[PDB]
Design a protein around this ligand. Sequence first.
Ligand code: LP5
Length: 239
Amino acid sequence: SVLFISDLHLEAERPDITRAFLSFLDERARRAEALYILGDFFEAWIGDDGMDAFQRSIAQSLRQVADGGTRIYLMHGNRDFLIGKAFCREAGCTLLPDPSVIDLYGEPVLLMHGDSLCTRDEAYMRLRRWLRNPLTLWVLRHLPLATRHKLARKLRKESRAQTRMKAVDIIDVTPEEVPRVMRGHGVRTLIHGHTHRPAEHPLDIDGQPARRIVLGDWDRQGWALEIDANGHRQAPFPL
Ligand SMILES: CCCCCCCCCCC[C@@H](O)CC(=O)N[C@H]1[C@@H](OP(=O)(O)O)O[C@H](CO)[C@@H](O)[C@@H]1OC(=O)C[C@H](O)CCCCCCCCCCC
């Protein structure tokens, strides 16, 4: 089987999430063929050269699972898009671009963090385009660590303020973007996180059934999607 998780927002100040995550590695990820982490694994990332002791310990825990035979894949999210290849080597994982299509038991499956589908959130779209500009990425990776933390705090603070003012249908995925991107990639299954609204959404693409599976965030309970050759299940578990 293969496991999918996202939106853990791991940080030292949430040991309830960390404990649940490590228990998840011990009870489930170790016996899976692969684990996919679809963004927002960490609460924030300021660049691989700014990794702190907590983040390093998380990497070591991932690496123990990878070294035991489970393949681990990590995709960027809006919190942790600065993760680079050094971190991935340390954690024993492979960096996957957003979007990626994988072969899952003979079916092509599209993986995204999900924020790129939230096209009605125009202020966020402007921010995202800027953050992912190669010039921005270069600058951010070459600022003093103290300065990076200050910018990260500012971004979090302004984001929390603005998001409290946005209706659900500003921040959730744009409905018509879903068939657009799924058709474009030739898939009938899409898995993403970001929106904190765990669910499975049927839809019709060109007359055929399709599904969009949304991974749950770990703020109040853990979530995992498990897929094997014969079916799938997403379910929560306590922190
Ligand atoms: C080294 C510096 C870079 C470090 C990067 C590490 C990031 C640390 C966390 C901050 C980034 C991220 O949280 C911001 C973000 O993505 N917010 C959108 C997201 O809400 P979350 O709060 O992330 O859950 O999802 C919401 C739903 O999709 C969406 O609405 C939120 O986006 C906003 O609220 C954006 C506002 O609308 C516009 C904010 C403009 C901010 C201007 C100040 C930036 C200063 C420069 C930062 C480098």
